Design a protein that fits this description.
The chain has helices spanning 8-18, 55-60, 66-74, 76-79, 93-106. It has 108 residues and is mostly helical. The protein has a single domain (1-108), classed as Cytochrome c-like domain (Cytochrome Bc1 Complex, Chain D, domain 2), CATH 1.10.760. It is globular. The two termini are 21 Å apart. Bound molecules: protoporphyrin IX containing FE. Residues 18-19, 21-23, 33-35, 37, 40, 45-46, 48, 53-54, 56-57, 83-87 line the site of protoporphyrin IX containing FE (HEM). Its main location: mitochondrion. Belongs to the cytochrome c family. One of its GO terms (cellular component) is mitochondrion. InterPro entries: Cyt_c-like_dom, Cyt_c-like_dom_sf, Cyt_c_1A/1B. Its cofactor is heme c.
Length: 108
């Protein structure tokens, strides 16, 4: 145990305000700046087909679980140096918790 469940509603609104800009979550959603995230959890870093990932991502070969996702969310480039993800992070564990919740839920 190292991650706890937050508000999905709250997660939904954070995403729209901080991730929507570059990503879709729906099944059959298009990749945009960032890849479609439908089905992320269970998946390894940089394997969505038809998406052009940096070398960095592929090489990392992360198992997208809720826990990893939270560390990544605090600081992407930190986690996967060279990554083309241009996001500062989420310093608050409470905002991250909400988000992963939303994510866990909406990319399923
Ligand atoms: C919002 C805070 C947000 C989330 C959530 C998010 C998720 C995310 C993941 C989990 C990946 C890696 C997935 C995989 O391995 O297939 C990923 C990668 C990229 N993203 Fe992202 N991301 C969020 C924020 C944003 C924003 C605001 C942007 C655009 C300015 C963006 C874009 C990208 C890009 C580009 C990548 C690919 C990295 C690479 O190939 O090196 N994301 N995102």
């Amino acid at each position: 145990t190292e991650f706890k469940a937050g508000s999905a509603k709250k997660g939904a609104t954070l995403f729209k305000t901080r991730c929507l800009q570059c990503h879709t979550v729906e099944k059959g959603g298009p990749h945009k700046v960032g890849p479609n995230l439908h089905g992320i959890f269970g998946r390894h870093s940089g394997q969505a087909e038809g998406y052009s990932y940096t070398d960095a991502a592929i090489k990392k070969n992360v198992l997208w679980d809720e826990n990893n996702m939270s560390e990544y969310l605090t600081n992407p480039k930190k986690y996967i140096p060279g990554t083309k993800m241009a996001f500062g992070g989420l310093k608050k564990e409470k905002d991250r918790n909400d988000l992963i919740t939303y994510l866990k839920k909406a990319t399923e």
